[PDB]
C-alpha cells in the first residue's frame, strides 16, 4: 500500500530510498544485494521494511472514481 | 576531571565515542534519557477541510504524525499545556499548510516539502521539514490523479518522547562494555566450544586479550564503554546528547530543590 | 524399478490454508490443525473494491507485508500480492513479568 | 540437448500452465 | 471511563507534592522515600551513588507494578549522621560530576571539529 | 496467534528505555515464554524464524517447500558468513540497568497475523436492567445489554 | 475465501461409530487436505479438497 | 574471648571437579592427628587449589547473636581475619562412629564438609562457627 | 556440493533465449 | 433446568484475563470501566457516615463513586440527573449504593466448572487498563491457560452472603483440594525454573541483586543475614537468601536414592528451623505433593500464611530471574554427529532384525506364540522390536545431551515436556497408529498405492525412521496426520458422553 514511515525496528525516516530503490532495479538491471548496499542502510532492521512492503495503492488508485 | 569521552567517528547524522571513568547507572540512565526525554516540535491535531483521495482520514493524520520538523529553537517556545492561552497561540505552537490537486493525466505525488510554513514564525528557526534525498523530497504522503483534493490544517505542539514515539529523537542506540569477557558476568551458550561457535566484538581492539591463563580478576568493575547513537536528523545529534545531558541535570536539579522546600 | 508414474511434485498433496504452514513437515500434526482453523479468522485484506463494497463485517489492517518466509505454492495463491498479516521481530524470553 | 530427463526444480512451470488454465474455482465453474 | 489519569507519566498531580517522606518504625534512623511520576531514570542511578559512598548502610529501590509510573527507596545509616542530608550531599555529587561531563564532552567535540 | 497455533493475548506493553536489547539496539517487537516450545513440539516456528533471518540479511526472500532438501546446516553455515551466531543465539542486555544477562537469547523476524476476536465485543457487565416478558428475567444479548 | 469455496460436507447423523468415516483413511490421499480438517463435534464431517 | 577451637595443618590428598565451573570438593589429612579426617566443599576458581597442597582450618567462634552485618569498615579488625579462606556457616547434626571418633558437618550456606577427631570430644564444636584457611 | 538453497529463474529465460 | 435450577442473574462481568507476578492469591484485578458499573449497597451508621458523605458527594464518575441512595421507604434517588447534587444530609438508617471500591470480597467462576475448584473468592486491588488480572498460581486448578478464555463474575448484596463468602470460598482455606487428598495449588512452570536455576550450588550473587530481593520482600524483619562468603567480597547462596523468603521452623526431608547427608548428586531436600542447608529446588519437592512444602506450611503453621509464603517465593524468583534471563533454541535440539549416527545404526540393525524375523515367517517355520495367532504373534515381535529401538535411541540422545542444554535443564527442572517429548522431537517418532495395529492396508494387498504389492516392512506399513528436525517423508507425514486425526476424533465424542454422565 504506502510504504510507511520510522521502522517499527529502528526508526530512522524511511521511504526516502523508495523510488530510488525502484529506479535501482529498471535503468540498472541491478541486483537488489548490492543494490540496498549502495542504497545504504547497513543495519537489517529497515532494510527488511523495504524487502517484504508490497504496494497496494497502485492498484488502489487506477480505479476511476468520480 | 572525573568522566573523560573521547570521540572515534562523526557525520551529520550519527556519532560513535568513548566514554570511560564512569559507572553502569551513569551510562544507563543515558541512554534512558536520550531515548525518553529530549522535547521537539511534531505534528499533533489535525484538521480535515475537505478530503477525496481513496485513503481515510484519520489513516493521512497518523501519517502525518511521524513527519519531522526543525528543531533548533524548540526551547524559546512553550508547552501549551503550562501556557496560560488557549487554542495554540504564536508562542505556544506553530500552523500547517497543505495543498494538493488532481492535475494530470498521470499519477501525482505529495513530498513533505510541500506543506508550507502558515502563522507567526517569530524569526524562531522552527518546523522546517527535513529533506535527506539528493531531490530534496521529503518522504512521500499519498498518491492522487486528475480529481481529488486534500486542503490541511494542521496544528503542531510540543510533546515528548515518552508518552509517544512521535517526539522520539532518537530512533536507534547501540551499546558496549566489556567486549572480551573479561568481567565474565556472563558465559556463552556453546555445543562444543566457546571460542569457535562465536564471532569477535568489532570493538575488540581496544583492550588486550585475557593473557590466557591468569587467576579470575574478582576486584574489576565495568567501564569503558562504547555509544554509537545516530538520530533521526530532526535535529543535530551533538544538540540531541548536550541536550540529554541537560534535561536529566534540570530533573534531578528539580528533585533536589523539591526536598529541601520540604 | 517398475514405476509408471510419478507426482508433480509431494508438496500439492496439501489444501489451501495448508500451503501457507512454514515447513510443514517440521512440527505436529495437531498443530496444522489449529492453524488451518485459525487462518480462517485472520483479518488483514480481503479484496480491492472496498471502497464502493459494502457489507456489514469489514477488517482492513494498515500496513500488510508479504511473509520473510512462504513455500512456492502461495505464489500461485495470489497470497504474496495480498497478505495476510505483517512480518515482525519476535524474542523468546521468560522476561520475568508477563 | 532438449530432450533431456526433468530435474525436480522444474515442475513449478507445469504448475503454473495448469493454473492458468484452469483456476481454483474450476470445480463450481465447470 | 474514570481510570487514574495520563498526567500520570511526568505531570506533578495538583493538591499533591513531586514526593512524601516517610519514617519507619522497623530500624533505628530508617526512613522510606516515596517517588512518583518518574522511573529507573533517577531511580537506579540515586541508588547506584548512595551506595558509592559509604558512610551511609543500606539501600535498595524498587516499582511496585509498571501500571504506576511511582517507586519507593529505603534508607537508614548510622546514628547523628542523616538520610535527607545524606542524599542531598549524593546529589551534589551528581550533579558536579555530571558537569564536568557536559563541558569536557563540548570541549572534546569541538576539539574535534572537521577542518 | 502465530503461524503454528500460539494463540493468547498481550499482557502489558513497556517502552524501549526497558526493553530488552542488543549491540545494535534491535529492540524487539514481542516476547513470550519459552514453555510453549517444549511441550508444543513447534519446532516449524523456530526454523521459521532462523530462516527468516538470513532471508533479511541476504536480501534473497525465504522458501519453506514442505518436501525439500533445505536443512538447518546450509542455514546456518549461510547466517555464519553472514557474521552472526551459528544458531541465532545472541548477547542481549538488561532492560532496566543494562548489566549482561546470563543466558542468551534466541531472536529475530517471524511472521504474525491478527484475529478477529477483539475485546470490546467481549466486554460486557450489567446491573438491573432489562426485563423480559415471558419470565420476568434479564434479557439475553449483548447487543440489548443482556447478563 | 479460496479456502472456503472449496469445502465438502457429508451427512451422518446423531452419534455414530467410529471406524466409520468419522476417522480418516488411506483412501483420502491425492484429494483431500490431511490437516485441514475443522474441529469441534464435526471433526472429519467437513473436508477439503 | 573470641577464640580457635580446633587449629592443624591438613595435606589434600586430590581435588574433584563434579561437573560445575565455581566449586568442587577437597578431602585432606591431618599431619598430626592421624585418626582425624577433613573434606571441604569450596569456591574452586576464586582460591585455586591443587594436589599435596598443606592447609590450615580454624574455628573462629567469634571475631573479637550477632547483629544485622555491618560492610566491612577499613579500619584495623584485630580478628580472627588475617588469612584468606574465611567463610561462616551453621552447624546441623553430631555423629558417634567407632564409639570414639566423634563426627559433625557443619555448613556454610550451600557447602559441606565432615570432620573427624577424639581428642577435643566437648572443646570441639554447638550451632554456627566460622572458618580460617591460609594461603 | 551446491544444494540449490535458493533459484533463478529469468537468468535461465535469457540462456534458453541464446540456445533456441 | 433453564429457569429453576439455572437462570439468568444480575451484577455480572465477563472479560478476558492476563497473568501478573506481583499480586498475591487474594487480590484480584478489576478493570474500572466495570467498577463503574457495577454497585453494592450498604447501610448508614455513625462509623461510615463522613467516607458515604464523602463519596455521595464524589458524584457518578469519580471511580470512588455512588449512583443511587435509599432512604427508609421504598426511596430510589438517581445521582445522573439529581439537580440537588450537592445538598443530601443523608441521614442515619438509610441505604446507598457505591462503586467497588477496594479489597471488597468477590466470588469467581469459569465455566465449566468440575469440582469444589473453580470457586474462589477474592479480595480486588482495582486496575485500569480493561481487562482482568489474577494471580499466576492459581491458573491450573481454574483449569484455564490464557487462549481467550472468559470469567465470570458475580457480587454478594448482604453482609450474611458476603461474609460467608469471605469466610468459605476464599483462597486460604482452599489450598488443599479435599477430592485429591493431596493439595492441588502450586507455584508453576516459569517461576519453577527460575528456581531451579536459583537454588543450584554453584551460583552466586552480589550485594546490588541482593538488598533489592531483601527490600522486595514485604515482611522483611529488617536484618540482613550474615554474608555467607567474605574473603574479597560479601556473597551469597540463592539458597540463603531464599531462606530469607522461607517462615520459620519448618522442617522437610526427602532423601532420595543419594542424599547420604554429603549429597554428591546433590539430589534431596533438608530445611531447618525456616533456612535452606543443602539441595535442589524441584517441583518434586516444592510443588504440588504428597508430602509438599505448601501441605506442611498449612497443616502446620495456618492456613493464610501459606499465601503471604506464594507471595514472597514468587515475586523474589521474579525479580532474580529478570536480570538472569533465560531461554532455549534449536541448539537444544541439535546434538552430536557421532551419536547421529549410532541413532542411525541402532535404527538399521533393528531393522535387519525385523527382516530375519520376517524372512523366518515367510519360510513358515516360527513359533505361532501361545494364546494369540500366528499373525499377531508376528506383530507382536515387530512392535516390541520398534518401540525398544525407539527407546533405546532416547536414552543415547538423552545420556550424551549436555548440561548447559536448556530444555534438559526445563525438563528434568520439571515443568513442561519430559524424555519422550526430547526424544520424540529429536531422535525419531516409532511407528504411528491407530487402535493398535499399525496402518492397515486401505488399498488392496498394500499400505498406501506407491510401494509395490504385499509388504511388512518398516517403511511399508511406515514406521517412522527420521526425527523432527531433519524433516519427513510425506508418507510418514501422512501417518502422523492418521494417528493426529484419531487423537482429534475421540476427544470430541467423548467430551459429551462424560458430559451426560457427569450431569
Ligand atoms: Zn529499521
Ligand atoms: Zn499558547
Given at each position: ?25 529498471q ?32 492498484k ?7 | ?7 572515534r ?13 564512569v559507572?553502569?547507572?551513569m551510562?544507563?540512565?543515558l ?24 485513503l ?46 488532481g ?21 524562531r ?37 515518552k508518552?509517544?514515539?512521535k517526539?522520539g ?11 572480551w ?10 555445543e ?9 566484538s ?5 583492550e588486550?586479550?585475557?593473557?590466557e ?15 554509537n ?24 536539579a528539580?528533585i ?7 | ?8 511434485h ?9 500451503s ?34 459494502m457489507?456489514?463485517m ?7 507485508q ?13 497470497f504474496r500480492?495480498?497478505?495476510?498479516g ?5 524474542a ?7 | ?8 526444480e ?21 | ?12 498531580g ?48 524498587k ?9 519507593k ?9 542523616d ?18 561531563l557536559?563541558?569536557?564532552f563540548?570541549?572534546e567535540?569541538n ?5 | ?7 493468547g ?11 530488552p536489547?542488543?549491540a545494535e ?11 510453549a516450545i ?8 523456530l ?14 526472500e ?19 558468513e ?29 511472521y ?36 | 475465501?479460496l ?12 452419534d ?11 483412501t ?22 | 574471648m573470641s577464640?580457635?577451637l580446633?587449629?592443624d595443618?591438613?595435606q589434600?590428598?586430590e581435588?574433584?571437579?563434579?561437573r ?16 582425624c ?5 569450596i ?30 569498615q ?12 574465611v ?24 557447602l559441606?564438609?565432615r ?12 550451632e ?8 | ?11 535461465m529465460?535469457r540462456?534458453?533465449?541464446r540456445?533456441? | ?5 439455572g ?31 457495577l ?38 434517588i ?6 440537588r ?39 480486588v ?57 493431596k493439595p ?29 530481593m ?5 515482611d ?5 543475614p ?21 517462615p ?9 536414592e543419594?542424599?547420604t547427608?554429603?549429597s554428591?548428586?546433590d539430589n ?11 539441595g535442589?529446588?524441584?517441583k ?7 508430602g509438599?512444602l ?13 499465601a503471604?509464603?506464594?507471595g ?10 529478570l ?27 533393528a531393522?535387519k ?16 506364540k ?5 499373525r499377531?504373534?508376528?506383530e ?22 549436555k ?7 526445563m ?16 531422535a ?39 526425527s ?20 482429534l ?15
Open positions: 500500500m504506502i510504504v510507511p514511515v520510522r521502522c517499527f525496528s529502528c526508526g530512522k525516516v524511511v521511504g526516502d530510498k523508495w523510488e530510488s530503490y525502484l529506479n535501482l532495479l535503468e540498472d538491471e541491478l541486483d537488489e544485494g548490492t543494490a540496498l548496499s549502495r542504497l545504504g542502510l547497513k543495519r537489517y532492521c529497515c532494510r527488511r521494511m523495504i524487502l517484504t512492503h508490497v504496494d497496494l495503492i497502485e488502489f488508485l487506477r480505479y476511476n472514481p468520480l | 576531571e572525573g568522566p573523560q569521552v573521547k570521540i567517528e562523526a557525520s551529520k547524522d550519527n556519532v560513535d565515542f568513548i566514554l570511560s571513568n559507572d553502569l547507572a551510562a544507563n540512565s541512554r534512558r534519557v536520550m531515548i525518553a526525554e529530549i522535547p521537539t516540535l511534531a505534528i499533533d491535531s489535525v484538521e480535515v477541510e475537505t478530503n477525496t483521495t481513496v481515510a482520514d484519520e489513516f493521512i493524520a497518523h501519517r502525518l504524525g511521524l513527519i519531522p520538523l526543525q528543531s533548533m529553537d524548540i526551547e524559546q517556545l512553550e508547552y501549551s499545556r503550562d501556557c496560560f492561552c488557549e487554542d495554540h497561540c504564536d508562542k505556544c505552537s506553530v500552523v500547517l499548510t497543505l495543498q494538493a490537486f492535475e494530470s493525466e498521470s499519477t501525482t505525488n505529495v513530498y513533505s516539502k510541500d506543506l508550507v510554513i502558515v502563522s507567526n514564525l517569530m524569526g528557526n522552527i518546523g522546517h521539514p527535513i529533506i535527506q534525498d539528493k531531490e530534496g523530497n521529503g518522504v512521500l504522503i499519498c498518491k492522487l490523479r486528475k480529481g481529488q483534493e486534500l486542503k490541511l490544517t494542521c496544528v503542531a505542539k510540543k510533546g515528548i518522547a508518552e509517544h514515539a517526539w529523537p532518537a530512533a536507534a542506540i547501540e551499546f558496549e562494555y566489556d567486549p569477557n573479561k568481567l565474565k558476568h556472563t558465559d556463552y551458550w556453546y562444543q566450544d566457546s571460542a569457535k561457535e562465536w564471532p569477535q568489532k570493538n575488540c581492539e581496544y588486550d586479550p585475557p593473557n591463563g591468569d587467576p579470575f580478576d574478582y576486584k574489576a568493575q565495568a567501564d569503558t564503554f562504547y555509544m547513537v545516530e538520530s533521526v536528523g530532526s535535529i543535530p545529534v551533538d544538540q540531541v546528547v548536550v541536550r540529554g545531558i541537560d534535561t536529566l541535570q534540570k530533573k534531578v528539580s533536589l530543590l523539591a526536598l529541601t522546600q520540604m | 524399478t517398475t514405476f509408471t508414474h510419478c507426482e508433480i509431494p508438496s500439492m498433496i496439501l489444501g489451501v490454508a495448508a501457507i504452514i512454514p515447513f510443514p513437515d517440521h512440527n505436529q500434526s495437531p498443530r496444522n490443525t489449529y492453524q488451518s482453523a485459525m487462518g480462517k479468522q485472520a483479518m488483514g485484506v480481503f479484496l480491492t473494491n472496498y471502497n464502493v463494497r457489507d456489514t469489514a477488517n482492513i489492517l494498515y500496513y500488510p508479504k511473509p520473510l518466509g512462504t513455500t512456492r505454492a502461495m505464489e500461485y495463491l495470489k500480492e495480498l497478505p495476510a505483517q512480518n515482525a521481530i519476535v523468546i524470553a521468560c522476561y520475568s513479568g508477563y | 540437448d532438449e530432450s533431456a530427463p526433468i530435474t525436480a522444474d515442475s513449478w512451470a507445469v504448475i503454473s500452465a495448469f493454473f492458468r488454465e484452469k483456476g481454483l474455482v474450476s470445480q463450481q465453474l465447470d | 471511563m474514570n481510570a487514574p489519569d495520563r498526567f500520570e507519566l511526568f505531570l506533578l495538583e493538591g499533591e507534592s513531586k514526593l512524601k517522606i516517610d519514617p519507619d518504625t522497623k530500624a533505628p534512623n530508617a526512613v522510606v522515600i516515596t517517588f512518583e511520576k518518574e522511573d529507573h531514570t533517577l531511580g537506579n542511578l540515586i541508588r547506584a551513588e548512595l551506595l558509592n559512598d559509604r558512610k551511609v548502610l543500606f539501600a535498595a529501590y516499582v511496585e507494578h509498571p501500571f504506576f509510573a511511582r517507586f527507596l529505603r534508607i537508614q545509616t548510622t546514628e547523628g549522621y538520610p535527607k542530608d545524606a542524599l542531598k550531599n549524593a546529589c551534589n555529587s551528581i550533579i558536579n560530576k555530571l558537569g564536568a557536559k563541558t569536557n563540548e570541549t567535540w576539539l574535534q571539529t572537521l577542518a | 496467534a502465530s503461524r503454528h497455533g500460539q494463540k493475548t498481550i499482557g502489558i506493553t513497556y517502552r524501549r528505555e526497558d526493553m536489547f542488543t539496539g534491535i529492540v524487539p517487537d514481542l516476547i513470550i515464554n519459552p514453555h517444549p511441550s508444543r513440539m513447534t519446532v516449524a516456528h526454523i521459521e524464524c532462523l530462516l527468516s533471518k538470513v532471508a533479511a540479511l541476504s536480501g534473497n525465504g522458501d519453506a517447500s514442505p518436501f525439500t532438501d533445505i536443512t538447518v546446516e546450509g542455514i546456518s553455515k549461510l547466517l555464519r553472514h557474521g552472526y551466531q551459528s544458531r541465532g543465539f545472541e548477547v542481549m542486555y538488561n532492560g532496566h540497568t543494562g548489566k549482561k544477562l546470563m543466558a542468551q537469547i534466541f531472536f529475530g523476524p517471524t504474525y497475523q491478527r484475529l478477529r476476536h477483539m475485546v470490546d465485543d467481549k466486554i460486557h457487565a450489567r446491573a438491573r436492567g432489562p426485563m423480559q416478558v415471558l419470565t420476568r428475567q434479564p434479557v439475553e444479548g449483548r447487543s440489548r445489554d443482556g447478563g | 475465501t479456502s472456503h469455496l472449496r469445502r465438502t460436507n457429508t451427512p451422518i447423523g446423531r455414530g461409530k467410529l471406524a466409520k468415516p468419522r476417522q480418516l483413511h488411506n483420502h490421499w491425492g484429494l483431500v487436505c490431511p490437516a485441514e480438517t475443522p474441529e469441534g463435534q464435526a471433526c472429519g464431517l467437513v473436508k477439503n479438497l | 577464640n580457635t580446633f587449629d595443618i591438613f589434600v590428598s581435588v574433584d571437579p563434579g560445575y565451573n565455581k566449586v568442587c570438593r577437597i578431602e585432606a589429612a591431618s599431619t598430626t592427628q592421624d585418626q579426617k577433613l573434606t571441604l566443599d569456591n574452586v576458581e576464586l582460591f585455586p587449589v591443587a594436589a599435596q597442597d598443606s592447609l590450615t582450618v580454624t574455628i573462629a567462634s567469634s571475631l573479637n547473636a550477632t547483629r544485622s552485618w555491618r560492610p566491612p577499613a579500619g584495623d579488625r584485630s580478628l580472627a581475619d588475617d588469612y584468606d579462606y567463610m561462616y556457616g551453621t552447624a546441623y547434626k553430631f555423629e558417634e562412629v567407632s564409639k570414639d571418633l566423634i563426627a559433625v558437618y557443619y555448613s556454610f550456606g550451600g559441606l564438609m570432620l573427624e577427631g577424639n581428642y577435643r570430644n566437648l572443646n570441639n564444636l554447638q554456627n562457627a566460622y572458618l580460617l584457611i591460609r594461603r | 556440493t551446491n544444494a540449490s538453497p535458493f533459484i533463478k529463474r529469468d537468468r529465460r540462456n534458453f533465449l540456445m533456441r | 433446568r433453564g429457569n429453576l435450577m437462570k439468568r442473574v444480575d451484577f455480572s462481568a465477563r472479560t478476558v484475563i492476563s497473568g501478573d507476578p506481583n499480586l498475591e492469591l487474594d487480590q484480584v484485578g478489576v478493570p474500572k470501566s466495570i467498577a463503574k458499573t454497585t453494592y449497597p450498604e447501610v448508614v451508621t455513625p462509623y461510615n457516615i463522613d467516607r458515604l458523605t464523602q463519596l455521595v458527594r464524589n458524584g457518578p464518575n469519580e471511580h470512588p463513586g455512588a449512583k443511587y441512595v435509599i432512604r427508609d421507604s421504598g426511596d430510589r438517581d445521582l445522573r440527573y439529581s439537580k447534587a450537592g445538598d443530601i444530609q443523608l441521614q442515619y438508617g438509610w441505604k446507598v449504593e457505591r462503586h467497588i471500591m477496594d479489597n471488597d470480597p468477590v466470588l469467581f467462576n469459569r465455566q465449566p466448572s468440575l469440582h469444589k475448584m473453580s470457586m474462589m473468592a477474592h479480595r486491588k482495582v486496575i485500569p487498563y480493561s481487562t482482568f488480572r489474577l494471580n499466576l498460581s492459581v491458573t491450573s486448578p481454574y483449569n484455564a491457560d490464557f487462549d481467550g478464555d472468559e470469567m465470570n463474575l458475580h457480587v454478594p448484596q448482604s453482609e450474611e452472603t458476603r461474609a460467608e463468602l469471605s469466610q468459605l470460598c476464599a483462597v486460604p482455606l482452599q489450598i488443599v483440594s479435599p477430592q485429591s487428598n492441588c495449588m502450586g507455584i508453576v512452570q516459569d517461576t519453577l525454573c527460575g528456581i531451579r536455576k536459583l537454588t543450584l550450588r554453584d551460583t552466586f550473587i552480589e550485594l546490588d541483586q541482593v538488598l533489592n531483601l527490600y522486595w520482600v514485604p522483611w524483619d529488617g536484618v540482613i550474615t554474608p555467607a562468603i567474605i574473603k574479597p567480597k560479601p556473597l551469597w547462596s540463592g539458597k540463603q537468601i531464599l531462606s530469607v523468603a522461607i520459620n521452623g519448618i522442617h522437610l526431608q526427602r532423601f532420595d543419594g542424599t547427608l554429603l554428591p548428586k534431596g531436600m533438608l530445611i531447618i528451623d525456616g533456612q535452606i542447608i543443602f535442589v529446588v524441584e518434586k519437592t516444592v510443588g504440588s505433593s504428597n509438599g505448601i501441605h506442611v506450611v498449612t497443616r502446620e503453621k495456618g492456613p493464610q500464611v501459606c503471604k509464603l506464594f514472597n517465593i514468587q515475586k523474589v524468583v521474579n525479580f532474580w530471574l536480570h538472569n534471563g533465560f531461554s532455549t533454541g534449536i541448539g537444544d535440539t541439535i546434538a552430536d554427529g557421532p551419536t547421529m549416527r549410532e541413532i542411525t545404526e541402532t535404527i538399521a540393525e531393522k532384525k525385523v527382516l530375519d524375523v520376517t524372512k523366518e515367517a515367510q519360510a513358515n517355520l516360527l513359533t505361532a501361545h494364546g494369540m495367532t500366528l499377531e504373534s508376528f507382536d515381535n515387530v512392535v516390541r522390536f520398534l518401540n525398544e529401538a525407539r527407546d533405546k535411541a532416547g536414552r543415547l540422545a538423552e545420556v550424551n545431551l548440561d548447559l542444554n536448556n530444555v534438559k535443564q525438563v528434568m527442572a520439571g515443568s513442561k515436556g519430559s524424555f519422550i517429548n526430547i526424544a520424540q522431537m529429536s525419531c517418532v516409532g511407528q504411528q497408529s491407530v487402535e493398535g495395529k499399525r496402518i492397515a492396508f486401505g488399498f488392496v494387498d498394500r499400505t498406501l498405492p506407491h510401494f509395490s504389492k504385499d509388504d511388512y516392512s518398516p517403511e511399508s506399513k511406515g514406521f517412522v525412521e527420521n523432527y528436525l531433519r524433516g519427513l517423508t510425506p508418507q510418514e507425514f501422512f501417518f502422523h496426520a492418521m494417528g493426529g486425526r484419531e487423537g476424533i475421540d476427544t470430541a465424542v467423548k467430551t459429551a458422553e462424560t458430559g451426560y454422565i457427569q450431569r
